[PDB]
Design a binder for this molecule. Structure first.
Ligand SMILES: CC1(C)O[C@H]2[C@@H]3OS(=O)(=O)O[C@@H]3CO[C@@]2(COS(N)(=O)=O)O1
Ligand SMILES: [Zn+2]
Length: 258
């Protein structure tokens, strides 16, 4: 029972066990749309998930992970500000107790109802564990969620949450296509940052899509029915598992669009 998102173990407490929490390149951050500068040196973003192989979904106590077989370059992210190939290992979300909060990154200080994170590791480092020890070890694709119409591509995810309500529970999740969670446009903002959960390693190149995807109230409400706790323990609804914006410090957020 280490860190968490509560009053006594949340984000403001993390620095104690993880000093880097107060580092020079921490995530998330607020994205100032007026200050972000168009970067013409950015290469076209390339998301290739046609051969993605989903395997299982797991409730890890602070979020749920949809894992993918990454033993091969089946689903990768390249281009944009990245050099090399980054392999998709899993995707997860961060959400709130209410629609007005839940996203980790913010846009002009605006918080979205949730935020999808598709985690990829630089194949040049061999495995995920070694990549996190490198400044350019990971590339995380962030996609904001706003409440409106339902997202067809997300329902299969929503429907299985009933089977992994508590910590430690997992369920088979093969044959799920992550392309169903992407918005139409790939316009994005990018900057060098870190993991948003301990160990908060500063090994991430963040790519945050400007266009949010719409999900229905019914869909988000199901996310809020998950538990932080393990089976048979007092219920602690899994909500507000997001780290607030951190100081930008010596960084510049670049935009892929003019
Ligand atoms: C599941 C979740 C949020 O936990 C985090 C842990 O960071 S870690 O690199 O030590 O390994 C775990 C898996 O990756 C993460 C990455 O989260 S994130 N929010 O930075 O994208 O995803
Ligand atoms: Zn995340």
């Amino acid at each position: 029972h280490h860190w968490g998102y509560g009053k006594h173990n949340g984000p403001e407490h993390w620095h104690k066990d993880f000093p880097i929490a107060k580092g020079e390149r921490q995530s998330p951050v607020d994205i100032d749309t007026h200050t972000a500068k168009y970067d013409p040196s950015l290469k076209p973003l390339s998301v290739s998930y046609d051969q993605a192989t989903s395997l299982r979904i797991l409730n890890n106590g602070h979020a749920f992970n949809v894992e993918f077989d990454d033993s091969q370059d089946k689903a990768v992210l390249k281009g944009g500000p990245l050099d090399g190939t980054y392999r998709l290992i899993q995707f997860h979300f961060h959400w709130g107790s209410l629609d007005g909060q839940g996203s980790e990154h913010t846009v002009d200080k605006k918080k979205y109802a949730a935020e999808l994170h598709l985690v990829h590791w630089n194949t040049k480092y061999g495995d995920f564990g070694k990549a996190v020890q490198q400044p350019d070890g990971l590339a995380v694709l962030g996609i904001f969620l706003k409440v409106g119409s339902a997202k067809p591509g997300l329902q299969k995810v929503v429907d299985v949450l009933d089977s992994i309500k508590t910590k430690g529970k997992s369920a088979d999740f093969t044959n799920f296509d992550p392309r169903g969670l992407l918005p139409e446009s790939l316009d994005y903002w990018t900057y060098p940052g870190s993991l948003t959960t301990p160990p908060l390693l500063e090994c991430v190149t963040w790519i945050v899509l400007k266009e949010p995807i719409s999900v229905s109230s019914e869909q988000v409400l199901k996310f809020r029915k998950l538990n932080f706790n393990g089976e048979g323990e007092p219920e602690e609804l899994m909500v507000d598992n997001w780290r607030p914006a951190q100081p930008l410090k010596n960084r510049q957020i670049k935009a892929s669009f003019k």
